[PDB]
């Protein structure tokens, strides 16, 4: 792109070789405020960007009416990183460009476990999870190997992104409003790490934030 100037601590570190992966940023909870943080760390040839929806919205005005376009982006790596944008712009290309920014901010990692057969690398979600936006709520159920992605084409996409290849699913409520279904499905795949399991606990040690360690070089950064 055009030449870039970080206004973020993280941004500086990422432009240097200090933070070299998403993991570091995630592990000590910090918000991503610049999409350029994603592009630098995760190289292109792993990232994919699809537009799940583009639709007109209308706002009422006396006589003629102004119009706009909502759209969704979806983004991520098949290595277990996903992130869903949605944004609004008064023209087509506007809302498109805007979506992809927001999407790369909202990126979250994915835990994949097993069904109770352990071979290779994860093919299955570690547990049942649910996510809800509007009246729709999705129930992701873990499936045995070779099941394939058993869901509708709308979530099939969203699951392919997140590296889940074996699942069984069902939805509830009004599912024929597209937008609500997307957000729902995504909140599901978050909830994995949000749930405490015996395998994880051992009172795993914490250490200093990248920010703190690199404080000196951020001071120098400011200059």
């Amino acid at each position: 792109k055009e030449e870039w100037v970080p206004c973020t601590k993280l941004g500086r570190l990422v432009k240097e070789q200090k933070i070299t992966s998403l993991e570091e940023i995630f592990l000590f909870s910090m918000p991503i405020k610049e999409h350029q943080i994603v592009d630098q760390l995760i190289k292109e040839s792993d990232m994919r960007d699809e537009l799940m929806l583009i639709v007109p919205v209308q706002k009422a005005t006396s006589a003629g009416q102004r119009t706009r376009f909502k759209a969704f982006n979806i983004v991520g790596d098949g290595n277990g990183h996903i992130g869903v944008g949605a944004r609004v712009g008064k023209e087509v290309s506007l809302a498109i460009r805007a979506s992809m920014i927001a999407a790369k901010l909202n990126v979250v990692p994915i835990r994949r476990g097993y069904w109770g057969n352990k071979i290779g690398e994860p093919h299955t979600i570690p547990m049942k999870v649910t996510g809800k936006c509007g009246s729709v709520s999705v129930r992701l159920i873990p499936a045995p190997r070779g099941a394939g992605i058993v869901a509708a084409p709308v979530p099939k996409k969203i699951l392919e992104f997140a590296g889940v290849e074996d699942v069984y699913t069902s939805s509830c409520g009004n599912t024929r409003t597209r937008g609500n279904f997307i957000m729902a499905t995504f909140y599901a795949l978050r909830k994995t790490y949000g749930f405490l399991t015996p395998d994880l606990w051992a009172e795993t040690e914490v250490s200093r934030d990248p920010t703190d360690e690199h404080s000196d070089f951020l001071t120098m950064g400011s200059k």
Partner: protein, 129 residues
Amino acid sequence: TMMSVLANALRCIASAERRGKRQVLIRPSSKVVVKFLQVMQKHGYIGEFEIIDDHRAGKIVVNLNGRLNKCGAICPRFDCTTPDFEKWVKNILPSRQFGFVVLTTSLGIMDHEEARARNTGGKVLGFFY
């Protein structure tokens, strides 16, 4: 009134756990409620518990380490069997890996895992994650 002793106990535990509280009080006591707690304390989900004596009915008190996520009760005590371990373990639990259903048998009170091992089914009791 209460028509299941277990239901009265394990809705105090679940609520308390969702608020992160590190001890809970339990109004009644039974021989049954003891055994249920015992299981989970072995597998590491409870620190300790005390039974206190009022010489009418006891008041259990438990120390939560926050390692639980739910403790349920299967109220009608439906019949589960050697094939039908599979059925329950899928349907009410989020996993087959760390889901624990607890059952009653003539032998005693035990996990499904140990039930299969000794090859006796029975009537279900409760469950936890």
